[PDB]
Design an enzyme around this catalytic site. Structure first.
Site, mmCIF file in Angstrom:
data_model
loop_
_atom_site.group_PDB
_atom_site.id
_atom_site.type_symbol
_atom_site.label_atom_id
_atom_site.label_comp_id
_atom_site.label_asym_id
_atom_site.label_seq_id
_atom_site.Cartn_x
_atom_site.Cartn_y
_atom_site.Cartn_z
ATOM 1 N N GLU A 255 -2.357 -3.542 7.269
ATOM 2 C CA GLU A 255 -3.996 -4.670 7.331
ATOM 3 C C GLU A 255 -3.477 -5.826 5.896
ATOM 4 O O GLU A 255 -4.566 -6.080 5.681
ATOM 5 C CB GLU A 255 -5.170 -3.859 6.401
ATOM 6 C CG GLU A 255 -5.845 -3.519 5.452
ATOM 7 C CD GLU A 255 -4.679 -1.617 5.528
ATOM 8 O OE1 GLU A 255 -4.014 -1.108 5.970
ATOM 9 O OE2 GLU A 255 -5.831 -0.967 4.545
ATOM 10 N N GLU B 24 0.432 -1.333 -0.050
ATOM 11 C CA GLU B 24 0.204 -0.067 0.174
ATOM 12 C C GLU B 24 0.927 0.861 0.085
ATOM 13 O O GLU B 24 2.239 1.394 0.691
ATOM 14 C CB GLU B 24 -0.589 0.115 0.880
ATOM 15 C CG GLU B 24 -1.640 0.979 0.711
ATOM 16 C CD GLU B 24 -2.999 0.894 2.226
ATOM 17 O OE1 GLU B 24 -3.515 0.722 2.873
ATOM 18 O OE2 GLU B 24 -4.192 1.971 1.774
ATOM 19 N N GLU C 237 -9.684 4.569 5.629
ATOM 20 C CA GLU C 237 -8.935 4.583 7.235
ATOM 21 C C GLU C 237 -9.554 5.782 8.026
ATOM 22 O O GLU C 237 -9.373 5.865 9.139
ATOM 23 C CB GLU C 237 -8.098 5.929 6.395
ATOM 24 C CG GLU C 237 -6.772 5.687 5.643
ATOM 25 C CD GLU C 237 -6.154 4.016 6.328
ATOM 26 O OE1 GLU C 237 -6.191 3.411 7.289
ATOM 27 O OE2 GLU C 237 -6.013 3.235 5.844
ATOM 28 N N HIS D 157 -9.796 -3.158 10.232
ATOM 29 C CA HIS D 157 -9.504 -3.242 8.961
ATOM 30 C C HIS D 157 -10.062 -4.182 7.315
ATOM 31 O O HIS D 157 -10.125 -4.536 6.785
ATOM 32 C CB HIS D 157 -8.309 -2.777 7.925
ATOM 33 C CG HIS D 157 -7.657 -1.091 7.841
ATOM 34 N ND1 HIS D 157 -8.674 -0.500 7.437
ATOM 35 C CD2 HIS D 157 -6.690 -0.842 8.150
ATOM 36 C CE1 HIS D 157 -8.006 0.904 6.927
ATOM 37 N NE2 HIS D 157 -6.745 0.463 8.227
ATOM 38 N N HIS E 236 -6.532 -1.504 14.756
ATOM 39 C CA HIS E 236 -7.290 -0.445 13.412
ATOM 40 C C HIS E 236 -6.735 -1.676 13.139
ATOM 41 O O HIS E 236 -7.473 -1.774 11.389
ATOM 42 C CB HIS E 236 -6.429 0.650 13.242
ATOM 43 C CG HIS E 236 -5.798 1.611 12.378
ATOM 44 N ND1 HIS E 236 -6.385 2.349 12.073
ATOM 45 C CD2 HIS E 236 -5.135 0.855 11.260
ATOM 46 C CE1 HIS E 236 -6.277 3.192 10.561
ATOM 47 N NE2 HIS E 236 -5.184 2.172 10.510
ATOM 48 N N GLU E 237 -5.860 -2.421 12.570
ATOM 49 C CA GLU E 237 -5.547 -3.160 11.129
ATOM 50 C C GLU E 237 -6.847 -4.515 11.263
ATOM 51 O O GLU E 237 -6.813 -5.315 10.342
ATOM 52 C CB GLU E 237 -3.927 -3.728 11.422
ATOM 53 C CG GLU E 237 -2.545 -2.905 12.130
ATOM 54 C CD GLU E 237 -3.053 -1.040 10.478
ATOM 55 O OE1 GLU E 237 -3.777 -1.499 9.645
ATOM 56 O OE2 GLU E 237 -1.950 -1.102 10.929
ATOM 57 N N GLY F 66 3.137 2.548 10.706
ATOM 58 C CA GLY F 66 3.215 1.719 12.574
ATOM 59 C C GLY F 66 2.888 0.803 11.929
ATOM 60 O O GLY F 66 3.700 -0.316 12.765
ATOM 61 N N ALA F 67 1.502 0.187 10.814
ATOM 62 C CA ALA F 67 1.830 -1.304 10.395
ATOM 63 C C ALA F 67 0.463 -1.166 9.373
ATOM 64 O O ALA F 67 -0.101 -0.236 9.075
ATOM 65 C CB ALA F 67 0.616 -2.404 11.383
HETATM 66 C C1 LIG Z 1 -2.478 2.525 12.307
HETATM 67 C C2 LIG Z 1 -2.522 3.596 12.874
HETATM 68 C C3 LIG Z 1 -3.244 4.007 13.677
HETATM 69 C C4 LIG Z 1 -1.162 4.600 12.435
HETATM 70 C C5 LIG Z 1 -0.734 4.870 11.113
HETATM 71 N N1 LIG Z 1 -1.459 5.821 10.931
HETATM 72 C C6 LIG Z 1 -1.194 7.199 10.160
HETATM 73 O O1 LIG Z 1 0.124 6.882 9.315
HETATM 74 N N2 LIG Z 1 -2.043 7.823 9.578
HETATM 75 C C7 LIG Z 1 -1.805 9.315 9.424
HETATM 76 C C8 LIG Z 1 -1.346 10.723 9.571
HETATM 77 C C9 LIG Z 1 -1.006 10.958 10.904
HETATM 78 C C10 LIG Z 1 -0.682 11.437 12.021
HETATM 79 C C11 LIG Z 1 0.070 12.825 11.393
HETATM 80 C C12 LIG Z 1 0.577 12.550 10.327
HETATM 81 C C13 LIG Z 1 0.134 11.216 9.044
HETATM 82 C C14 LIG Z 1 -0.605 3.974 9.970
HETATM 83 O O2 LIG Z 1 0.584 3.346 9.872
HETATM 84 N N3 LIG Z 1 -0.741 4.009 9.185
HETATM 85 C C15 LIG Z 1 -1.235 2.862 7.426
HETATM 86 C C16 LIG Z 1 -3.034 2.385 8.073
HETATM 87 O O3 LIG Z 1 -4.012 3.048 7.711
HETATM 88 N N4 LIG Z 1 -2.663 1.338 8.601
HETATM 89 O O4 LIG Z 1 -3.380 0.104 7.993
HETATM 90 C C17 LIG Z 1 -0.453 2.992 6.297
HETATM 91 C C18 LIG Z 1 -0.572 2.500 5.489
HETATM 92 C C19 LIG Z 1 -0.119 2.330 4.458
HETATM 93 C C20 LIG Z 1 0.051 3.857 4.148
HETATM 94 C C21 LIG Z 1 0.649 4.899 5.573
HETATM 95 C C22 LIG Z 1 -0.201 3.763 6.200
HETATM 96 ZN ZN LIG Z 2 -5.618 2.006 8.141
#
Ligand SMILES: CC(C)C[C@H](NC(=O)NCc1ccccc1)C(=O)N[C@@H](C(=O)NO)c1ccccc1
Ligand SMILES: [Zn+2]
Ligand SMILES: [Mg+2]
Ligand SMILES: [Mg+2]
Ligand SMILES: [Mg+2]
Length: 890
Positions: A268, A124, A324, A305, A301-302, A265-266
């Site tokens: 899905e 992704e 999201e 999803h 969160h994951e 972070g992670a």
């Molecule tokens: C899982 C989540 C709690 C943490 C993190 N979130 C962000 O990146 N949020 C956007 C953000 C928040 C604060 C400041 C800047 C940006 C993240 O790991 N996003 C993933 C995602 O949506 N995994 O499902 C993910 C998957 C793939 C690509 C990107 C992100």
């Molecule tokens: Zn997500």
């Protein structure tokens, strides 16, 4: 630059039905052989067949076993493989490619890469095209049969999505495993892992159908004992989705895997969720308290999803918020239920009103469903996630729990196994809204503006009370500032959760009600209101808006003390602080600009200070809530209210305010810091990685907040308490001892002590690095050079890089040094980082987002660094798009 527009969305002329992969991992190369069983769609007009494929080395291309040749039947430019239409069959066909890729040199951590000794993928958003050719977009759904082969000694555990259907030996010390994922999916949910992994496991029995699910959590051998809490959080997540939403897991197995080197972070991936080790691994001896909330959040969160993103996926990337925003909202309901503390909701509000509101008033401001992008990776923003979640939470506020669950069910059932759009969700919620109003003419067409309109609304209030009639009116206005997305802004559907407090006795006067504001302004009138009330507005933070409560500080104090709603109490406090901050900021700024020899400052309100003492001394009030009331609003929240901000004047303002309050309350702070010890640091559950007391963790937060205030104050003999605190078994305590020792000579001995405690655990060392980075030290620049040379060195681990630099960028006084040296240091790191990891380089740009809010000298310095970064040859497209938008060039 090449721009994609939301309005231009068209279904493909092609269909990919099945994907059959062989991924053969060697030391210096990985060979990917891929058969795509394809077809021609009803939208086909005889166009060329164009595949995404980035940095792939082609060994062979065929269609229906006819070899195709470069320059004759296809062209490949390192980005797109074009098969000329003459050679594209007109019915079902098999497309075969074999390519070579190199995980071992992939430092961008997108596609297939090596993280220490684990081979891992991240697809992704546009990573699958880095592994093999595909029509790399989320409406191209297919079923996957995936064989992975590798050296058995190096890579004994092989994983891909879905059922493991075979395992076999291969000559020369190799082995293979085959996976079948029976659920149709977009290619962004593809994953593979190979490594020497260890695990914990458990069996989970689903609630309604009693399906047995095997749960595995994996890591490198060294950190296997740090997997227990993640597994427990997964069981909690599965139970929550069963209990609240009625949703069960849909495969026989679910794997969670930690890797050291990860951009976010992670992720899905179906049946194979991959995590940054910092968001999966903890132990109570080796992790700070916040790791437990983080893991609970990210696992949840994951897991969530699996329905909101996997079983119902996206038609296109402009719909990102649909998965999201909705998944964040699901995770927030889950976390509030699991923690049962008011600080969980407050922390989300705090984050939004600081980080997301700053974004929304910046040149990067976008609606939650953007109109265009260059790199989709730049649209994974706090706006899309956090504003998105608040938009998704408003539906629950408007409908209530019963009808919310009805509409969610309509959505998930109707679109199962398919793509969806934001309109599909709004339509499901509109069905529930009609049922709730009992009126099939009710509609949520207006609600769509929350998806399309950028900016934060400002909601303002005026009140009137008629004592003779016992009748009270709240007149409400909404305004969103015009911006580059809409030069004319329209009124939103704003749900305003309200109560009314009797100021004389502090009690509730009405059943709680939600006002449905739909016009630019409206007046809401209440009968049988027996005395003039104090309104309790936007309870729970009921819409993502700037609130102008129009209350006096006397009224705000009474809410702070007696209101039932934690958000409104916290907001009333926030507003008292902001009024004081704005006033003192203006006083200092005038004195600076006018070069005055003397001037006045407006003291902090003495009745407010009394109210803070009364709350702190109340044994039955909440420790977490208390830590919020003794802290000023975050700097990013404060900056949303100031133009031409002199950071140095703001730093002086904060210090004056903190000092005023401490000169009255430091003895109270000390007494509470001592009295909280027994309960805060009780060792109940210290050996139980399946259970966290979040109340007790809030008590530690409060102690550590108090200790910082007392340390900065040089309260008598506080160094003694600091040294004792450094012996606590909780890393939250002994790393706080480092941070607070910054004000004393002892800092370098505590720096050494904690280093030695941190250095043999990769994640604990990174928490140490952050603790140093955010230390309030006059010599912070020399300390950062010492980190760079002694610890970070040449690491390409995004967690190490982010640990060293990002906390420092929050140091208002030092990062914004009027020389520009802070800006220059971070820009060099960005540019350095951009040469191997464009995503991380853009993350490191975050301090520049507020450039146009600063005083004009600081604007000029930041701008000069931004333009210098933009002139870097071979700048990534990620970083270029981000900087061009941010500097008003795109
Ligand atoms: C899982 C989540 C709690 C943490 C993190 N979130 C962000 O990146 N949020 C956007 C953000 C928040 C604060 C400041 C800047 C940006 C993240 O790991 N996003 C993933 C995602 O949506 N995994 O499902 C993910 C998957 C793939 C690509 C990107 C992100
Ligand atoms: Zn997500
Ligand atoms: Mg390559
Ligand atoms: Mg249960
Ligand atoms: Mg490392």
């Amino acid at each position: 630059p090449k721009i994609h527009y939301r309005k231009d969305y068209k279904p493909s002329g092609f269909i990919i039905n099945n994907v059959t992969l062989n991924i053969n991992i060697h030391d210096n190369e990985t060979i990917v052989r891929s058969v795509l069983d394809m077809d021609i769609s009803k939208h086909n007009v005889g166009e060329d067949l164009v595949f995404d494929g980035v940095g792939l080395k082609i060994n062979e291309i065929s269609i229906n076993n006819k070899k195709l040749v470069e320059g004759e039947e296809y062209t490949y430019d390192n980005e797109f493989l074009t098969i000329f239409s003459k050679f594209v069959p007109k019915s079902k066909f098999a497309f075969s490619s074999e390519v070579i890729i190199h995980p071992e040199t992939n430092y961008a951590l997108t596609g297939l890469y090596k993280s220490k000794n684990i081979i891992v993928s991240q697809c992704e958003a546009t990573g699958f095209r880095r592994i093999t050719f595909f029509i790399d977009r989320p409406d191209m759904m297919a079923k996957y049969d995936v064989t992975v082969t590798a050296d058995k000694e190096k890579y004994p555990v092989l994983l891909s999505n879905g059922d493991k259907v075979n395992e076999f030996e291969i000559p020369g010390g190799r082995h293979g495993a085959r996976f079948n994922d029976p659920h149709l999916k977009p290619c962004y949910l593809f994953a593979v892992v190979a490594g020497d992994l260890k695990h914990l496991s458990a069996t989970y029995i689903t609630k309604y159908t009693k399906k047995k699910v095997e749960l595995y959590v994996f890591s490198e051998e060294k950190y296997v004992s740090k997997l227990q809490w993640a597994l427990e959080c997964l069981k909690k997540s599965m139970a929550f989705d069963e209990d609240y939403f009625g949703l069960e897991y849909d495969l026989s197995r679910l794997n969670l895997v930690a890797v050291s080197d990860f951009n976010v972070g992670a992720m899905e991936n179906k049946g194979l969720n991959i995590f940054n080790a910092n968001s999966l691994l903890a132990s109570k001896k080796n992790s700070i308290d916040f790791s437990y909330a983080r893991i609970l959040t990210v696992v949840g969160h994951e897991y969530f999803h699996n329905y909101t993103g996997n079983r119902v996926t996206l038609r296109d990337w402009f719909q990102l918020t649909l998965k999201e925003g909705l998944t964040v909202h699901r995770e927030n309901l889950f976390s509030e239920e699991m923690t049962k503390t008011v600080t969980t909701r407050l922390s989300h509000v705090d984050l939004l009103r600081s980080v997301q509101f700053l974004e929304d008033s910046s040149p990067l401001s976008h609606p939650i469903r953007p109109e265009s992008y260059v790199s989709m990776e730049n649209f994974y923003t706090t706006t899309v996630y956090d504003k998105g979640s608040e938009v998704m939470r408003m539906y629950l506020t408007i409908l209530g729990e019963e009808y919310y669950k009805k509409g969610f069910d309509i959505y998930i059932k109707k679109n199962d196994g398919n793509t969806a759009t934001c309109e599909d969700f709004n339509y499901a919620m509109e069905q529930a809204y009609k049922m709730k109003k009992a009126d099939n003419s009710a509609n949520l067409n207006q609600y769509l503006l929350w998806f399309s309109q950028s900016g934060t609304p400002h909601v303002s209030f005026k009140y009137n009370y008629d004592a003779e009639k016992k009748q009270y009116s709240i007149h409400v206005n909404q305004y969103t500032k015009p911006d580059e997305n809409q030069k004319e802004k329209k009124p939103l559907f704003i749900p305003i959760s309200v109560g009314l407090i009797n100021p004389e006795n502090g009690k509730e006067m009405i059943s709680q009600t939600t006002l449905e504001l739909t016009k630019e302004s409206d007046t809401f009138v209440f009968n049988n209101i027996a005395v003039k009330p104090i309104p309790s507005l936007f309870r729970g933070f009921s819409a993502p808006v700037y609130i102008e409560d129009n209350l006096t500080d006397e009224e705000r104090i009474l809410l702070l003390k007696y209101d039932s709603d934690a958000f409104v109490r916290y907001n009333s406090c926030t507003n008292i602080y902001m009024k004081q901050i704005l006033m003192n900021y203006n006083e200092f700024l005038k004195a600076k600009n006018e070069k005055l020899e003397s001037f006045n400052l407006t003291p902090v309100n003495a009745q407010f200070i009394d109210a803070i003492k009364y709350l702190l001394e109340d044994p039955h009030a909440d420790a977490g809530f208390k830590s919020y009331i003794v802290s000023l609003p975050q700097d990013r929240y404060i900056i949303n209210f100031v133009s031409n901000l002199d950071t140095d004047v703001l730093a002086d303002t904060k210090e004056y305010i903190y000092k005023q309050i401490g000169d009255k309350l430091n003895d109270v702070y000390y007494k509470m810091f001592k009295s909280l010890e027994a309960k805060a640091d009780d060792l109940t559950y210290f050996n139980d990685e399946s259970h966290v007391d979040f109340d007790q963790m809030n008590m530690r937060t409060l102690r550590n907040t108090l200790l910082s205030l007392l340390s900065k104050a040089q309260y008598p003999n506080i160094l003694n308490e600091i040294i004792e605190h450094s012996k606590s078994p909780y890393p939250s305590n002994w790393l706080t001892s480092l941070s607070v020792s910054a004000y004393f000579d002892k800092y370098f001995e505590l720096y050494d002590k904690t280093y030695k405690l941190s250095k043999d655990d990769e994640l604990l060392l990174q928490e140490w690095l952050k603790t140093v980075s955010r230390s309030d030290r006059k010599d912070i620049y020399e300390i950062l050079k010492k980190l760079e040379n002694e610890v970070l060195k040449d690491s390409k681990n995004p967690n190490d890089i982010r640990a060293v630099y990002l906390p420092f960028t929050n140091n208002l006084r030092r990062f914004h040094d009027i020389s520009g040296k802070g800006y220059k240091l971070i820009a060099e790191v960005i540019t350095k980082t951009d040469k191997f990891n464009p995503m991380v380089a853009t993350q490191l740009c975050e301090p520049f987002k507020l450039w146009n809010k600063l005083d004009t000298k600081r604007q000029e310095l930041m701008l000069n660094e931004m333009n210098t970064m933009l002139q870097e040859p071979n700048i990534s497209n990620n970083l270029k798009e981000y900087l061009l938008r941010l500097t008003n060039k795109l």
